[PDB]
Amino acid sequence: FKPAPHKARLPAAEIDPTYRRLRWQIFLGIFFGYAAYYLVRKNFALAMPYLVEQGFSRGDLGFALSGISIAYGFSKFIMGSVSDRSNPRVFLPAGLILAAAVMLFMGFVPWATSSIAVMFVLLFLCGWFQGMGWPPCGRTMVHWWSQKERGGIVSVWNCAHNVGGGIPPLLFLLGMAWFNDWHAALYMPAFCAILVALFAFAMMRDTPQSCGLPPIEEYKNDTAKQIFMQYVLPNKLLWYIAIANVFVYLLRYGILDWSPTYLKEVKHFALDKSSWAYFLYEYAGIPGTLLCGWMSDKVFRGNRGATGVFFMTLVTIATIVYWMNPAGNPTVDMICMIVIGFLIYGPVMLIGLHALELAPKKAAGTAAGFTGLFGYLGGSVAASAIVGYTVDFFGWDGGFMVMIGGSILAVILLIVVMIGEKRRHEQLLQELVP
Numbered sequence: 001f002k003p004a005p006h007k008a009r010l011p012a013a014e015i016d017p018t019y020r021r022l023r024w025q026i027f028l029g030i031f032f033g034y035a036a037y038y039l040v041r042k043n044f045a046l047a048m049p050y051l052v053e054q055g056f057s058r059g060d061l062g063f064a065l066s067g068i069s070i071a072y073g074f075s076k077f078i079m080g081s082v083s084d085r086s087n088p089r090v091f092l093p094a095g096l097i098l099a100a101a102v103m104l105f106m107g108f109v110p111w112a113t114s115s116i117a118v119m120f121v122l123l124f125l126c127g128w129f130q131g132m133g134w135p136p137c138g139r140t141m142v143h144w145w146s147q148k149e150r151g152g153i154v155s156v157w158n159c160a161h162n163v164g165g166g167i168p169p170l171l172f173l174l175g176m177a178w179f180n181d182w183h184a185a186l187y188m189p190a191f192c193a194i195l196v197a198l199f200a201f202a203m204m205r206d207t208p209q210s211c212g213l214p215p216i217e218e219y220k221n222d223t224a225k226q227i228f229m230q231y232v233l234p235n236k237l238l239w240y241i242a243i244a245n246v247f248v249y250l251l252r253y254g255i256l257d258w259s260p261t262y263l264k265e266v267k268h269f270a271l272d273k274s275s276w277a278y279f280l281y282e283y284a285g286i287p288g289t290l291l292c293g294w295m296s297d298k299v300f301r302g303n304r305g306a307t308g309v310f311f312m313t314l315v316t317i318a319t320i321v322y323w324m325n326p327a328g329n330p331t332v333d334m335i336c337m338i339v340i341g342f343l344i345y346g347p348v349m350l351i352g353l354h355a356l357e358l359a360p361k362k363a364a365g366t367a368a369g370f371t372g373l374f375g376y377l378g379g380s381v382a383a384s385a386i387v388g389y390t391v392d393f394f395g396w397d398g399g400f401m402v403m404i405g406g407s408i409l410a411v412i413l414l415i416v417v418m419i420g421e422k423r424r425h426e427q428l429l430q431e432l433v434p
Contacts, residue, residue, distance in 0.1 A: 002086065002087065002090045002091075002094075003085055003086040003087050003090075004087060004090075005087070005206070005208075005209065006209060007206075007208050007209040007212065008209065008210075008212070009211075009212030010210065010212070011211070011212060011213070015210075015211045015212075015213060016217070018210065018211070019211060019213075019217070022205065022207055022210065022211070023144070023207075025203050025205075026140065026203060026204050026205055026207065027144075027152065028203060029092075029199075029200050029203040029204035030088070030092065030136075030137045030140050030141075030200070030204055031155075031156060031159075031160065032196055032199065032200060033092045033093065033096070033133075033137065033196070033197070033199075033200030033204065034092075034133060034134060034137050034156070034160050034164075035160055035163050035164035035196070036096055036100070036164060036193050036196040036197060036200065037096060037099070037130055037133045037164065037193075038160070038161060038163075038164030038165035038168075039100070039164055039165075039167060039168045039171075039189040039190065039192070039193045039196075040096075040099055040100050040103055040126060040130065040189070040190060040193055041068055041126070041130060041165065042165060042168065042256075042257065043103055043168060043186040043189055043190065044061075044064065044065050044068075044119070044123060044186065045065060045256075045257040045258075045259075045260070045261075046168065046169055046172055046186055046260055046275070046278075047183075047184070047186045048061045048065075048260075048261050049260050049261030049263075049264060049265070050182045050183050050184070050185075050186075051113075051114070051183055051184070054114075054183075056114065056116065057388075058388070058389075058392060059387070059388025059389045059390075059391045059392045060116065060117075060388065060389075061119075061388065062257075062384040062385040062386070062387060062388030062389070063117065063120065063384075063385045063388070064116075064117055064119045064120045064123055065123065065257065065384045065385075066120075066380070066381050066384050066385040067119075067120050067121075067123040067124040067126070067127055068123055068124075068126055068127040068130065068380075069127060069376070069377060069380040069381060069384075070124065070127060070381075071124050071125070071126070071127025071128040071130070071131065072127045072128075072130050072131055073127075073373075073377050074128075075127065075128055075130070075131030076131060076135075079131045079132050079135060080135055082132070082135075083132065083135040083136040083138070083139055084135075084139060086136070087136070087206055088136030088137070088139050088140045088204060088206065089136075089201060089204045089205055089206060090201065091132060091136040092132075092133065092136045092137060092197075092200055092201070092204065093197040093198065093200045093201035094132070095129050095130075095131075095132030095133050096129075096133060096193060096194070096196075096197040096200070097193075097194045097197040098129050098132075099125070099126050099129030099130055099133075100190045100193035100194050100197065101190075101194065102122060102125050102126055102129065103126060103186070103187065103190040103193075104187050104190050104191070105122060106119065106122055106123075106184070106186070106187070107184050107185070107186050107187025107188075107190065108184070108187060113183075113184055114183075137156075140204065140206075141153065141156075143206060143207050143208065143215065144215065145215040145217065145218070145220065146215065146220040146221075146222065147220055157349075158286075158289050158290070158345070158349065159286060161282075162282050162283055162285050162286055163283075163286075165282050166278070166279045166280075166281070166282030166283040167189070167279065168189035169260065169274075169275035169276075169278040169279055170275065170276075170279050171188050171189045171192065172185050172186060172188060172189060172275065173271070173272070173275040173276065174188075175187075175188035175189075176271075223362070227362055227363060227366055228366045228370065231359050231360055231362075231363035231366075231367065232359060232363055232366055232367050232370055235358065235359060235363075235367070236420070237358050237417055237420050237421060237424070238355060238358050238359060238367055238370065238371065240413050240414075240416055240417045240420070241351045241354055241355060241358070241371060241413070241414065241417050242351075242370065242371045242374040242375060243374070243413065244351065244409070244410045244413040244414050244417070245347070245348070245351045245371055245372070245374065245375030245376075245379065245410075246374065246375055246378045246379045246382070246406075246410075247379070247406035247407055247409055247410040248308075248312070248344070248347045248348060248351070248375070248379070248407070248410050249348065249375050249376055249378075249379025249380065249383060250378075250379045250380075250382045250383040250387075250402075250403065250406045251315065251316075251319065251340075251344060251403050251406055251407050251410075252341075252344040252345075252348070252379075252383070253379060253380055253383030253384065254382070254383035254384070254387045254399075254402075254403050254406075255319065255340055255403060256278070256281065256282070256341075257383065257384055258387070258399075259274070259277065259278050259281070259337065260274050260275060260278055262396070262399075263277075263333070265396065266327075266396065267325060267326070267327055267329040267333070268327070269327075269329075269330055273330075273334070277333060277334060277337040277338075278337070280334070280337060280338055280341075281337040281338065281340065281341035282341060284337075284338045284339075284341050284342045285341050285342060285344065285345045287342070288341075288342035288343055288345070288346065289345040289346060289349060292307065292311060292343070292345070292346035292349065292350070293349070295307070295310075296350065304350045304351075304353050304354040304357075305350075305354055305414050305415075305417060305418040305421075306418065307346070307350055308346065308347040308350045308351065308354075308410075308411075308414050309411060309414055309415070311343045311346035311347055311350075312346070312347050312407060312410055312411045312414065313411060314343055315340060315343045315344055315346075315407065316404065316407045316408065316411070318336060318339045318340050318343075319340060319400070319403065319404055319407065320400075320404055321336070322336040322340070323400045323404060347410070347414075348375070351371055351375070351414075352368045352371055352372055353368070354417075355367045355368035355370075355371045356368050357421075358417075358421065382402075382406075386402065387399050387402060387403070390402055
């Protein structure tokens with residue numbers, strides 16, 4: 001049984017010194033701990049093109065992949081309290097290895113891996129476990145030090161999905177030679193994830209327990225859900241960006257979860273470069289997104305909707321050119337992928353930020369969060385499931401129709417939120433009226 005606090009004070013003249021280390025120490029912990037989860041989500045994707053040379057794949061597999069998101073979905077509804085009770089040091093590795101092991105269940109046991117939604121169910125757990133991963137990472141950051149946190153986080157949101165999610169096709173690519181079987185080498189990435197998990201456990205801590213000093217060191221010292229229903233629920237404005245975020249997320253994931261599979265269906269050059277792109281795409285987001293921020297602050301003078309516009313437009317132009325390509329896509333897709341990815345995150349971050357302004361004082365928090373989930377939740381189901389099915393009764397072309405089309409609205413919609421937010425401003429004028 002764990003939770004366990006076990007706190008005991010040994011201050012002893014110069015706890016400061018063991019703090020510097022206990023902080024430089026722990027930060028890598030949760031950061032890489034969190035990063036490790038991402039090796040685990042997008043393994044099945046890589047499975048599908050390998051998997052199903054065999055009639056297996058309908059476009060159904062997408063429904064199967066669809067699992068991860070749903071569980072992550074029903075997940076936060078309750079895990080949000082558990083980590084609060086339990087201890088971040090254990091709970092984080094305890095969730096990873098718990099999940100990353102499950103993946104191993106698939107990569108090795110035939111019945112388990114090839115059944116047509118036996119996987120849905122196995123995968124579904126993955127989602128649930130994936131759930132735990134972040135909130136202890138949250139409880140920790142609370143124990144860093146107030147009014148500093150803004151910084152520790154800046155780094156965590158934007159780098160964490162990419163540093164980890166872009167490495168797995170690389171391992172599979174490598175595990176091909178050593179573990180010859182192709183239909184199922186989606187296990188090798190998971191093999192190492194457990195390893196990071198240990199490292200995670202071996203370096204994190206609560207930090208109340210050895211110092212005994214609630215973060216003072218500078219003497220910072222600092223209603224219900226209703227808010228969502230009261231301030232966020234109608235907000236016809238917040239809705240538009242949320243219904244917009246969706247398609248943004250569908251262009252990102254739908255283009256990405258198929259990237260290996262669609263390559264080698266048509267434009268089939270090789271697995272070698274295929275997987276070397278998926279890496280490149282997810283990793284190339286780091287520099288861009290980082291820039292998307294500065295360009296947005298310096299060039300667009302703080303207008304977030306408009307930066308999405310600049311970026312959202314730029315992402316769409318690439319997606320279509322890349323849509324128009326024959327077996328001469330070799331030196332087009334490399335750049336194509338490097339680019340698509342480079343920008344897709346731009347609006348993901350911007351909307352959220354945008355949301356903060358679209359409502360009152362506390363609403364921001366739950367206002368900006370609502371967006372992320374309405375966005376991610378749906379964005380995926382469609383990104384994965386629907387696309388697959390929009391290829392069975394239709395061609396593969398109709399795939400991009402929903403994707404390219406999807407983006408198109410995100411912008412038109414991002415426009416409306418821009419007009420609307422400003423029309424709203426003009427009305428305070430009527431406040432003086434009677």
